[PDB]
């Protein structure tokens with residue numbers, strides 16, 4: 108029903124704009140922006156649903172880890188605050204676990220807010236801008252999201268349409284509406300008052316809709332609709348963006364499920380054993396609560412958030428400004444990099460340009476027409492046009508036949524560039540006249556598309572007829588030049604369109620071929636170093652380009668790329684999906700493709716069990732970028748690429764992409780390392796508790812003691828994001844896993860339980876009796892009894908920390924530590940400082956308040972030996988695990 112406003116804008120004219128038409132200095136636009144924002148709408152991106160925080164927090168607080176923390180608080184409530192004996196009502200754990208629940212839920216909500224699906228500027232690090240002219244200063248580039256009905260945006264070459272907009276000024280405006288309607292050939296728009304309600308909305312020669320990227324031209328226009336009211340909004344309503352890529356959410360939930368399984372197995376066993384043997388069911392509940400607290404690694408979401416933030420910040424610092432947080436996982440799993448040859452593999456700066464006649468000799472007339480075609484072009488200026496302009500300007504002082512053409516001629520019409528036609532045209536004319544007949548129609552483009560258009564040739568000394576022998580001769584010379592490494596463009600010229608109009612493809616015919624211009628794009632100085640690094644790291648660099656095969660093969664061979672059976676688009680059309688997948692999985696250089704052929708190639712490669720990353724900086728490559736699993740682009744590019752991309756790069760270089768991939772991999776490597784280490788250590792400690800529940804007459808450690816141990820360990824594990832990772836782990840694309848975590852827990856876990864039992868006995872027979880006498884003689888309620896219990900708890904507290912935090916330097920690498928794989932300095936410093944903090948805790952007022960005590964100095968050397976023994980046993984079990992289950996982590 109929104110079509111009423113659109114049809115009203117299409118009909119009438121600028122003279123009937125109740126919502127203001129004149130603006131940018133007089134339009135009453137300083138507070139009407141709020142009226143338009145509320146009454147009309149705002150530029151939103153609402154896809155299928157925007158459930159408010161009322162449901163967002165509801166679904167974020169039912170996370171399995173949050174459920175575990177809540178049930179820990181509930182059991183702590185149901186045991187330590189209500190069902191305890193009278194006088195034994197000490198909450199402590201209730202509040203200290205509710206705080207953990209809240210700190211997990213808030214961080215999970217923050218993550219899910221900035222976690223989305225593929226291309227989404229949720230982080231808002233880098234964005235896309237529109238040249239708006241508001242009534243304060245004007246000419247202020249603003250984000251596309253900050254656009255309201257009743258504003259003017261100037262549309263230029265490459266500028267994506269901000270919102271549903273009505274054209275006000277039009278100068279050779281051509282926009283590609285293929286992103287929403289098809290028909291990749293650019294559609295011409297004009298400013299008029301025609302009504303013509305009978306239309307499929309697509310044409311709308313007066314209306315420019317959202318997503319219709321401007322191929323060429325300069326045009327001002329007023330906004331008539333914004334937000335989901337735009338046709339882009341109804342297209343986004345059909346979300347169809349759900350994917351089955353295992354991400355951080357599923358991995359964290361699976362780790363929580365492994366913890367749930369281990370708890371559901373162990374806690375009932377401990378409860379049954381204690382209740383049936385000791386006859387103290389409340390003590391059994393305390394044992395179960397301690398086991399559940401120890402097994403569950405609280406302060407895990409904080410570590411996950413730290414890892415994600417560190418990865419995002421580091422990737423941004425490595426000239427790789429990422430988008431929605433799931434970009435890290437998507438890019439880190441890239442098997443195939445499908446890029447182009449322009450810019451990525453070649454320094455686009457053309458240093459070898461040639462203006463050649465039909466024979467192959469120099470002739471400045473061709474350069475003159477090329478300069479006329481380039482300097483009077485409203486479209487995107489590529490390297491060829493810039494090289495032509497610079498060379499002509501540098502040589503103008505020598506031969507003034509090129510004498511300044513910027514003022515002696517004035518543009519009067521233009522034909523844009525279509526991939527179908529491969530030729531761009533301009534009709535230029537002298538402004539001062541002097542001949543009353545000068546309307547040249549210079550056209551520059553490809554080889555065969557230009558030859559099939561021209562009907563006569565030039566040079567020699569005459570306008571010779573286009574003999575097929577001449578056509579074959581020109582084509583063969585062009586092929587020779589292309590195989591020499593230089594790309595060539597052919598120019599044509601027609602004259603005397605006395606009515607300066609009717610310029611269609613029909614008028615772009617029957618021309619005189621002046622000659623061809625040759626340019627060389629030298630290969631980049633990164634001589635396959637980036638290519639070899641990507642191959643080492645698990646990325647197959649495939650080239651998707653539409654240029655001639657000869658130049659592409661020359662460049663690829665110069666950059667050490669495989670010059671081999673190169674599939675052309677003509678073959679791709681004949682090759683069905685199965686054989687196209689076969690050749691794509693085999694070939695690595697694809698030349699002379701179409702914007703849709705690249706999309707088909709990417710789709711088939713992805714569907715053949717792979718992940719594809721397309722890097723593009725043009726209007727047409729977005730068709731394949733949206734078809735790619737991870738979208739990559741440069742900052743100096745068109746908006747249709749950046750909006751559809753995910754890995755926007757501050758510089759164009761494959762090494763930047765490689766470093767971004769490495770940092771993204773390191774994020775998950777450190778995350779899974781921390782998860783495995785914490786889970787295995789917790790399993791070992793609680794398994795020692797379970798196996799010693801039948802002997803010790805007291806709980807080995809209080810629930811508050813284990814909780815503080817875990818909190819200190821986790822807050823000292825915040826340097827895991829800044830931890831060095833072995834190259835052997837960073838050279839293979841990897842995804843989230845939980846089975847390896849479970850194997851690590853069940854294998855490298857009990858090796859700590861054995862020495863936990865050793866420390867149990869050494870406390871119950873060597874130190875606590877040394878300070879209080881034999882425990883059997885100790886009477887319950889005495890100072891000696893409570894002192895014995897507190898000293899045992901403190902001893903296991905200190906020993907457990909010293910073993911859990913110092914084993915990180917060993918289990919981090921599957922190799923010999925400190926000999927082949929050193930740790931990170933922040934990790935070591937944080938480990939040492941946390942260990943000192945825990946060792947100093949029981950000697951202060953915090954001890955004897957939680958239940959700790961000062962320890963005898965004889966207790967320290969036993970720990971010095973126990974830690975080393977644990978290191979050795981861990982190394983043995985680590986080599987066993989590596990050689991048995993393939994990899995350690």
Ligand SMILES: [Mg+2]
Nearest residue numbers: 792907910911
């Ligand atoms: Mg331990």
